[PDB]
Amino acid sequence: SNVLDGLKYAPSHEWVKHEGSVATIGITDHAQDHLGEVVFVELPEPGVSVTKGKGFGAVESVKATSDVNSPISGEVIEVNTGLTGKPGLINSSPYEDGWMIKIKPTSPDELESLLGAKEYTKFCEEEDAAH
């Protein structure tokens, strides 16, 4: 699918965007392309703490329920409430308007463990090739 360079990725197909002292999380284009039409998004509550590797919400498609794992840890400060109304933004704008949450990174260096665009692309290739 389509990959962007200014982001750090997770094997479970989530992306992060570091900007000063905040991280914007969402799911990649490869993810939505594989999920199919997204029909519902269940996001966490503000103030709640997310943990690296643990699920914070879920995305439902016409076929299934896909739990989204937080790529890093932090406190949720913001949530895209527009997704409840327009779940489709995930399919149409995964990297921009399809943003799910905004967190205060509690352990910033966790971003080092995160893959880059090229690293992720190779990854997506390997996973697609295992079929």
C-alpha span between 93 and 7 (Å, rounded): 15
Q: Which of 10, 23, 25, 35 binds ligand RED (CB under 6 A)?
A: 35
The nearer residue to ligand RED, 37 or 96, going by C-beta atoms, is 37
Tell me: does residue 41 bind ligand RED (CB under 6 A): no
Closest approach of ligand RED to the CB of residue 39, in Å:
11
Q: Which of 24, 57, 66, 94 binds ligand RED (CB under 6 A)?
A: 66
Tell me: does residue 122 bind ligand RED (CB under 6 A): no
Rg (CA), the chain: 14
Is 9:29 a contact under the CB 8 Å cutoff? no
Could you tell me how far CA 94 lies from the centroid of its own chain? 8
Q: Which of 64, 82, 96, 118 binds ligand RED (CB under 6 A)?
A: 64
Three-state DSSP state, 77: strand
Closest approach of ligand RED to the CB of residue 31, in Å:
4
65-69 sheet: strands from edge to edge: 38-42, 55-61, 65-69
